[PDB]
Amino acid sequence: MYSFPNSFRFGWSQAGFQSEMGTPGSEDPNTDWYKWVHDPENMAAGLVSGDLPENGPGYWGNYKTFHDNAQKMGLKIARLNVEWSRIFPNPLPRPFDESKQDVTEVEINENELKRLDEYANKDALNHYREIFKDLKSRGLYFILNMYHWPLPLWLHDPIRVRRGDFTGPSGWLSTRTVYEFARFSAYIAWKFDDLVDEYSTMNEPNVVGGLGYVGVKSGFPPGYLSFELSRRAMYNIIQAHARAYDGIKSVSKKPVGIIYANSSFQPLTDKDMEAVEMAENDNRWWFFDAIIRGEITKIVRDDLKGRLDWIGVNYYTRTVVKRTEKGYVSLGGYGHGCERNSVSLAGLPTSDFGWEFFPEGLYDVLTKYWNRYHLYMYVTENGIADDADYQRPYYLVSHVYQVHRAINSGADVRGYLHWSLADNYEWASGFSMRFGLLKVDYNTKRLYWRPSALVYREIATNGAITDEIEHLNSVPPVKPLRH
Amino acid sequence: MYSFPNSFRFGWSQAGFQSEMGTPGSEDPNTDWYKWVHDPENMAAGLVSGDLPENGPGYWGNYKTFHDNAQKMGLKIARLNVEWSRIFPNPLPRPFDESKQDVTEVEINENELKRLDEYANKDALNHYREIFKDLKSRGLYFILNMYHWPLPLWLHDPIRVRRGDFTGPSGWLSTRTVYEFARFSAYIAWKFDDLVDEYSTMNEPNVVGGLGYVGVKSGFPPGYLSFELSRRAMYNIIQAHARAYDGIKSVSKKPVGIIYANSSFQPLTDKDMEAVEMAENDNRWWFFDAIIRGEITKIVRDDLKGRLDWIGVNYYTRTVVKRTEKGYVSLGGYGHGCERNSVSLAGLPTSDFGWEFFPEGLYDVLTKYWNRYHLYMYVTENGIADDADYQRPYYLVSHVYQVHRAINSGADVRGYLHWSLADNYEWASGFSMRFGLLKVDYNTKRLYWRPSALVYREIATNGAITDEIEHLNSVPPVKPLRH
Amino acid sequence: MYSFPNSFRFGWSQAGFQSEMGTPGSEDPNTDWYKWVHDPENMAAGLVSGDLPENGPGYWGNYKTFHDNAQKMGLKIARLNVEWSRIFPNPLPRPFDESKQDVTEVEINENELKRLDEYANKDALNHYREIFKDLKSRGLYFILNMYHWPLPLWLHDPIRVRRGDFTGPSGWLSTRTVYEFARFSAYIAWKFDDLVDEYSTMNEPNVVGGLGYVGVKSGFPPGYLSFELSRRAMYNIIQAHARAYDGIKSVSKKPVGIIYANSSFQPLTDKDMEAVEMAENDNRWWFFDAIIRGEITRGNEKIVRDDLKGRLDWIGVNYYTRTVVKRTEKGYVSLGGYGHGCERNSVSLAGLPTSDFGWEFFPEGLYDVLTKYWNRYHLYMYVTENGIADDADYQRPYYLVSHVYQVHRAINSGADVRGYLHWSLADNYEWASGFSMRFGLLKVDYNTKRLYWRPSALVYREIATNGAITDEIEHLNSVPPVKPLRH
Amino acid sequence: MYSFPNSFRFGWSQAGFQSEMGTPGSEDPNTDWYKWVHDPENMAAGLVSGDLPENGPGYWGNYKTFHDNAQKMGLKIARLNVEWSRIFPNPLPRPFDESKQDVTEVEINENELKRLDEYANKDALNHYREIFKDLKSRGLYFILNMYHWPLPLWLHDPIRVRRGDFTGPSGWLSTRTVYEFARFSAYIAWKFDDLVDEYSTMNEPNVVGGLGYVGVKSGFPPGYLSFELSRRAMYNIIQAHARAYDGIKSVSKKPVGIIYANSSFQPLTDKDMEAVEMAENDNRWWFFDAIIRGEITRGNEKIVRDDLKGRLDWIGVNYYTRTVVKRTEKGYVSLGGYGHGCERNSVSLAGLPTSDFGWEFFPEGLYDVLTKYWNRYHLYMYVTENGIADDADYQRPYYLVSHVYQVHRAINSGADVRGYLHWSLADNYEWASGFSMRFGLLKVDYNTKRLYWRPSALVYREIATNGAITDEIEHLNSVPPVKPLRH
Numbered sequence A, B: 001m002y003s004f005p006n007s008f009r010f011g012w013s014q015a016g017f018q019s020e021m022g023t024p025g026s027e028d029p030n031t032d033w034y035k036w037v038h039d040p041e042n043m044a045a046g047l048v049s050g051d052l053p054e055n056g057p058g059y060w061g062n063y064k065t066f067h068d069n070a071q072k073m074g075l076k077i078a079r080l081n082v083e084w085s086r087i088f089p090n091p092l093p094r095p096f097d098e099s100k101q102d103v104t105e106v107e108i109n110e111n112e113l114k115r116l117d118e119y120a121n122k123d124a125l126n127h128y129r130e131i132f133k134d135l136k137s138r139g140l141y142f143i144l145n146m147y148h149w150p151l152p153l154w155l156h157d158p159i160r161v162r163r164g165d166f167t168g169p170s171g172w173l174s175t176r177t178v179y180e181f182a183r184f185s186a187y188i189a190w191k192f193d194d195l196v197d198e199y200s201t202m203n204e205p206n207v208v209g210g211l212g213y214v215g216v217k218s219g220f221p222p223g224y225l226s227f228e229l230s231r232r233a234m235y236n237i238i239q240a241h242a243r244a245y246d247g248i249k250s251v252s253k254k255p256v257g258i259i260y261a262n263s264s265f266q267p268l269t270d271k272d273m274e275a276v277e278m279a280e281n282d283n284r285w286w287f288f289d290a291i292i293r294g295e296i297t298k299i300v301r302d303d304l305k306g307r308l309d310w311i312g313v314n315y316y317t318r319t320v321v322k323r324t325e326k327g328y329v330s331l332g333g334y335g336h337g338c339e340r341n342s343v344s345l346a347g348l349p350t351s352d353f354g355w356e357f358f359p360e361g362l363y364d365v366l367t368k369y370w371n372r373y374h375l376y377m378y379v380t381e382n383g384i385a386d387d388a389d390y391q392r393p394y395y396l397v398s399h400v401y402q403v404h405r406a407i408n409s410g411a412d413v414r415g416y417l418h419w420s421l422a423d424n425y426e427w428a429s430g431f432s433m434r435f436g437l438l439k440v441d442y443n444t445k446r447l448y449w450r451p452s453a454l455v456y457r458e459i460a461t462n463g464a465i466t467d468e469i470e471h472l473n474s475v476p477p478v479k480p481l482r483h
Numbered sequence C, D: 001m002y003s004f005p006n007s008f009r010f011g012w013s014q015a016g017f018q019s020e021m022g023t024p025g026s027e028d029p030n031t032d033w034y035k036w037v038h039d040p041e042n043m044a045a046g047l048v049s050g051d052l053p054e055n056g057p058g059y060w061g062n063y064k065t066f067h068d069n070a071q072k073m074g075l076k077i078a079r080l081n082v083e084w085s086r087i088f089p090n091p092l093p094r095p096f097d098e099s100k101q102d103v104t105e106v107e108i109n110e111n112e113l114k115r116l117d118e119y120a121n122k123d124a125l126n127h128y129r130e131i132f133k134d135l136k137s138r139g140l141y142f143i144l145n146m147y148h149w150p151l152p153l154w155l156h157d158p159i160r161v162r163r164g165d166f167t168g169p170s171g172w173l174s175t176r177t178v179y180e181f182a183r184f185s186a187y188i189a190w191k192f193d194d195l196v197d198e199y200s201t202m203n204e205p206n207v208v209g210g211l212g213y214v215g216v217k218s219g220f221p222p223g224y225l226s227f228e229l230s231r232r233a234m235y236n237i238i239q240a241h242a243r244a245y246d247g248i249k250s251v252s253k254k255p256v257g258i259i260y261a262n263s264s265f266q267p268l269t270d271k272d273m274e275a276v277e278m279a280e281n282d283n284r285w286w287f288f289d290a291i292i293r294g295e296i297t298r299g300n301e302k303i304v305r306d307d308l309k310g311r312l313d314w315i316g317v318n319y320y321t322r323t324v325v326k327r328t329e330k331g332y333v334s335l336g337g338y339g340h341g342c343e344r345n346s347v348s349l350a351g352l353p354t355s356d357f358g359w360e361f362f363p364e365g366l367y368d369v370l371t372k373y374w375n376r377y378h379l380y381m382y383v384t385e386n387g388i389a390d391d392a393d394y395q396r397p398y399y400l401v402s403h404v405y406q407v408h409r410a411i412n413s414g415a416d417v418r419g420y421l422h423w424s425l426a427d428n429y430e431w432a433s434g435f436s437m438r439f440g441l442l443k444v445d446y447n448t449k450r451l452y453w454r455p456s457a458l459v460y461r462e463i464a465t466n467g468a469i470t471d472e473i474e475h476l477n478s479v480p481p482v483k484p485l486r487h
């Protein structure tokens, strides 16, 4: 067996936009993402799937069922977010000089929170309180995340921006968003601190800036291709993180961290180890050096330094890189860039999404963070698109083993949260990518236990990979799978 | 949910030759099958795999572990056989006219059993008693089968016969075997009646005669190609069944049945329904009409009539047939005649063994037997070769559902026994075909729970296909599998 | 045997941007498409492959070898374009009210032509003359096409437009481009008419407008997503075609047609026949009714323009695969998993093999397309493109024979089809996809620029030299066996 | 370019039983193989496919058409056999001590030949003359082979032997067959020497003995499993070859060789080179050392037989794929998943594509086999068979060019190789597998008996007419791309 520390918790992560809608009464039309996936032109271009989130798994109405299943599964931790748009669906009075590059301080006090109070949707707040109380009643430790991608439409009209029009609400391109995000975060902590165990400001800010402004074929808002604007967005979201951290801490003593999108950077040949380090700097260290050490672009900002208590590690697969004349490049045919339901250039099985099986990468990522910063971590996402459940039992057990391995090496990792408890709306890809331990019938909103859920219940209830399921710490056999 | 009657039992079947050996001390070199798979010429011809049963899962030594796992899995029934060769490894004194075609009576009484007693291996008998006592102590209902293919070498030297030499011990071609089988069966019931709940005389006599003397590419002993001798073997094994039934009943009041190899015969087109009936007559009814009604080839034998209390239905897949000028033919590309790890001509997934997914066939077979004979049934075998466990969760739930369906239609089916609890020696194919709910590491003899075992535990402990696993009553998705 | 009329020609089609560059001194850096595929942001987004056209098959320098192989293969017809950008690399003097929606007339006279002649690149002109004279010396009948997608940069900066900046050169969004295209076409006809047998104004305007402004994941310039701007570009390209036809006719008596991208629209179920007609209207008839019958929609009204009516002598049918459509509450939709929307090197939802590009094998659609055009307009046709992405040459022998058979079938039904031009003689630069998609009868080694005959080229030679699908290769009129192929 | 010597010939090989029947009046029901494939028990066991040779490509009636296509394809050599059973359908008079292990001499003189002539079927003889004269009229050099597996039923009843009854005609288990084969070969030479350029005594004796008595799942007659009887049959077939060589030489001055089934033995790891040598000894050298050097094992002793020594003028190299071997405690073993032991239409354990028959693409092995024979014996060779089961023709263009290149390489290294004969010109009856395995350059429609040129036939014509792999097809000297193929 592989036994975990008595305090280690197994659980799951999910997001508001992806899971909440589906039950009549749950509809939240007020985000950039809602508008984006309903857009006629985006649909015709195939940038979005045509599936709509209001036809979703219905966590808003059915949360008690989700929680019942999580409890039966032996889970002891959950990470979810509140949707900003639900709490503040209408524009807030403008506060503050918008032309200033840096946002070093956002003053938040009791009076200001009471004023914000008057703009908040009370029905939304009460409902979230009901969801989280039910969550806590199952013995679930609660990590509350403030943001998992959708912005209020009054902060970002993504179609205007796609069209090249920067005169409207411009999302992460505007310091007004940084300012309001800080206040929103403080406001939520102020309202929910009694229920929350730990906080995250944000989920994967690198993906928001990266796919929003560079990887435009991904169909992420606002899909405006610009290196310069991707930089500006990332700069703003970093400041937003720091200002949200200060805002939360003005109102709570609880740990505040951040959740980030990771890949394990692997050398194509033994001559590519420098390329790996350059990739890690460019995709990981530059960001965390900003919010932990205050290092940014080359100065030190005291308002950025030390704004992090813990690191949420999301991990799915690797990225293979090679050294280049001018620098380095990532290679197609490995990691996230494989054919769906096939095999990578290394002969490793790929998921319904075309992502390569590579659990060793998780050990790489956890130990590298630990060695650099010595901040404790949760694995906040790890899972696989696999409606049939062919690969998931292996994917699950193998990655859990790599976590045990990281802890064995000295890394302080305090939980593993699978993505996800149930199938949900996979962004521009729609419902066809199914990540759940539980299968969703979208017609009836019924949840079914895929065999991996029975496997995870084994792990969670025992706090270990048991002797009986240890064989799943291996690669899915490729011979019976599609090539 | 699909709930079964309170008296219905879920369990498993296994065979002595396939599971017993593997632990030092368990070796049984005294069968036709042992000699057959060790034969240098058979190995060079590829008729046998080259794997040897003494390197097996080791039920002989490890039975307590098998039973522990079965109990944890919620199983309540088991069907196993004693190996004839273990109990009588040495030739018995010749009794009886060998030239007579019919064996209508075998006189067995107390004195004769006491005499046989003096030739029996006491160590083997005591060991089986230990295995079965442990089995009963887990709350397992016990179906004891007398025969599952290997014969004592002193009754059958299969290499001599393969070579065309009929002067030696000739197995089912000799009425001496019919005579000794009747006595052996009576002897075992006499020794074990206190432990046994129900009896089977034989496992799949049609396969012994069919592959032994016609389907010679299967590498089954003695591999002598002869329509005439296949008929003679089948004639003898039928009489053997009847004489074993009388012999058991001379010593016990408990139910005595037989286990038979079934296929669901399906019409290629709607013009082939006559072909189906001809196939069913030729492969099923002729045999059961002999041992139930005494009808044989065209007379009635009173010594054959009514020799059956129950029917063991083994079922894996269908056979597609078409009408022919001269009669009917079976079609390649369906049922058992598909490519391994692929798809049939109907687009249905095939197993590691090349067998087509067709659970509806089981409903067909159970209801047809019920309607003809009105004898109660157990599903004595059903399973799939699937080391990876990709298809098994679906195979398991789908077939269990078809049993529920048969019962719903009025058929008296009293249990479902999966083939098998753990991986074992798949005859001429060796160890590579893995049918277990539990995976065997043959190096250490350790057993692991494949996810289907967790699924089966759900079914068995609840006496139902539960709401949560009901989605597995479907065909494995073929898109992610090999074509 | 399937024998063709004695006058029928077998040949090939090729485009300037895709095949010219690759030999020393052949580079043409002056187009929208050149800038588009070199753009750092386009490359990082994966909109373009990273492959560059200047590393291509080298027709500019190696044309004699291309033509040697075409002659050896028994080909008797070719359709190529001149690249506008090579002839006019620098801007011409502003002539004309850019605010006017319609361009009903473009006056071109001999004096105007002689002025234009002062701005034309003479080396480029002379080189094209050398290429075309060699072509004609092989006994190849010559269809000269004026345009096959790239525009001079001075007429379109696609990066600016991608960024949503409409103050610069805007390509088909500007009537200036319409005006200049007319003059350009008249000019090329004026200079080359002695070498040309028939003219086409343009290749697949519907793709330029459709992928440029709607199908933006395709990585075609300017990649600005706008239904309204797609409509505007299509409106301009239609009037450009008409003005180019009048311009060519002012200087030549020869036939002037257009080449258009076709799909065979097929009903998912027997209840989807209406859906097909609606798709045919929306993707085909609306365009050809504008340039043949003068019928068109301007803003929100349905009018006849006398300046558009009758501007077409022949139709170039480009055809690769079908589109499967189904009827919807609000209209019709096309279905993934058939036609061009399949997995690469696999099988469609109908069990038909797909190409290296994920396009479904459906030769029957060529019969559908040819006979439908014939019955509507009764204008003669050439099949101006038909071919398959297939480096290994597994499917091409079947693809070629089967589609050629379908043209024999169309003629048999009464359709006036005068030739079949395979895409392409050799591998070339497949737009945003780069070099990996190989459509050639001849394989190109891009390192040495050497050409190799795939077995389909030997098959094609059998067809062309005999003017028939011979008895000996007739079995290739069938679907490539799927069992040995990837699924 | 890979150019061959001016004297080198490209051609094909074909067998009587596999190609002759299919036309009215061509049936030969009088062989062991005919009875074997019609046998009800063999059919029900799946030992044989159920396909029947009398439904075959019809060379007996259509030979002129076969030869027309071979001439069109530029072929200059052919190797065929006469079927023994057609010439002597009824038993001959018993001559000779059947209990003697060795047959050191078979006296044949002109008087004996004239007596044999009284029993020969004259219609069959005249028909073969007609076939062979037509063959020679195409400029085809003629290798006549005496035997390619089927024996007259009066010499072998394979069902009896399958049943373990050795009292009837026992085929290669009886010296009577050795004795009669010698007379038969002398006889055919006597009758046909004016038409023949070179002779082979037999095709692949090692397969006859090996699959007949050991590899019994292959469904080859008599399918009686016995190491000892396999040894006995191989011993007899060896002496039959020697006696047939002396018999032919008594009547002809022409070269007399033998055709043998080859595999290239390859080491799994660098520690398996000894294993290869042992496999080469056991599967190849032991046989050829008997008939060239007279070295052999009788019962349990190693002797030189003067009556076996030097009975060979040339070696026919048949080659399809490799065998991968590894060293074992007790010796060596060959490995599944490489060579002929792969899944059909898939990839081997080495990632190389497999044929319709599950045979791995390994042209390098032909170089290995040719040079090894050359270095051991210094006898000239023809590649007498090489080809692939491939109905679709996906892999054959690569298979053909690559193996032909390997023969060019062998000659380059000094090996005297005088021709390459593809198996086969057209599809035919593949033994126990039936018609489904298609090896032809030409595809056969078995309903009409029409022949079609697969693209590989056009490729082969390029090679044969030029006497070279030309520059234009040189890219086919490569492995078929696996990505678009089934795995």
Ligand SMILES: OC[C@H]1N/C(=N\O)[C@H](O)[C@@H](O)[C@@H]1O
Binding pocket: A015, A018, A203, A204, A261, A314, A316, A381, A419, A426, A435
């Ligand atoms: O793609 C799976 C999963 N992965 C994610 N990042 O990699 C997102 O956080 C989550 O919203 C998404 O659903």
Ligand SMILES: OC[C@H]1N/C(=N\O)[C@H](O)[C@@H](O)[C@@H]1O
Binding pocket: B015, B018, B203, B204, B261, B314, B316, B381, B419, B426, B435
């Ligand atoms: O082939 C699976 C299984 N199936 C069986 N019959 O179909 C045999 O009873 C059993 O011994 C064998 O292992």
Ligand SMILES: OC[C@H]1N/C(=N\O)[C@H](O)[C@@H](O)[C@@H]1O
Binding pocket: C015, C018, C203, C204, C261, C318, C320, C385, C423, C430, C439
């Ligand atoms: O996609 C192949 C081919 N097909 C075309 N239309 O479909 C284009 O005219 C041509 O430039 C392109 O290369």
Ligand SMILES: OC[C@H]1N/C(=N\O)[C@H](O)[C@@H](O)[C@@H]1O
Binding pocket: D015, D018, D203, D204, D261, D318, D320, D385, D423, D430, D439
């Ligand atoms: O298996 C193809 C071919 N190969 C052969 N040896 O390998 C035989 O001589 C020939 O008869 C057979 O048809």
